[PDB]
Design a protein around this ligand. Structure first.
Ligand code: ZN
Ligand code: ZN
Ligand code: ZN
Length: 178
């Protein structure tokens, strides 16, 4: 097994996957690493199993059809993994906790949003469709763009949004386009 957390790249109290060499902090893994279960398989392994059981699940899909899916167990897992992929980027620190807005020339967003809030919402099964989760994710970055206007700090939102979008297209097998 790896000697650092796959998500945050730090050592510490790590839980090791039984079917792959990744390791995790307890609350770095999504969902939080399960109390018992020997062997234990991480989210990467669980996602790989879905594809292996249904190879056709990797044929291209339309985003509009993906968004309307109900949050059954496999879609719940996919949204968890996509959230985890964003936390894997160190620039996610900017978007993890509850923001505040006091900048000359700007007003805060009507509906603030952040990664830990989306994490709680997934854990509490508050999203009934994939669309719920994706809307909140994209709202994180949209609020950041709007607030920071022409400051160069706006680029952080663009960067972390690109990580989100790339991973969305991969995990949900969105049809490739030009
Ligand atoms: Zn970690
Ligand atoms: Zn694994
Ligand atoms: Zn199948």
């Amino acid at each position: 097994n790896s000697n650092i957390c796959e998500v945050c790249n730090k050592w510490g109290r790590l839980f090791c996957c039984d079917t792959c060499p990744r390791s995790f902090h307890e609350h770095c893994h999504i969902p939080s690493v399960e109390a018992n279960k020997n062997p234990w398989s991480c989210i990467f392994c669980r996602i790989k199993t879905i594809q292996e059981r249904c190879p056709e699940s990797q044929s291209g899909h339309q985003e509009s059809e993906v968004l309307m899916r109900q949050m059954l167990p496999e879609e719940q897992l996919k949204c968890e993994f996509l959230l985890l992929k964003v936390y894997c980027d160190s620039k996610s620190c900017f978007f993890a906790s509850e923001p505040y807005y006091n900048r000359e020339g700007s007003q805060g967003p009507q509906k603030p949003m952040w990664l830990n809030k989306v994490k709680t919402s997934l854990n509490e099964q508050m999203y009934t469709r994939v669309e719920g989760f994706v809307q909140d994710m994209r709202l994180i970055f949209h609020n950041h763009k709007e607030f920071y206007r022409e400051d160069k700090f706006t680029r952080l939102g663009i960067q972390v949004q690109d990580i989100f979008e790339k991973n969305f297209r991969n995990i949900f097998a969105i049809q490739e386009t030009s």
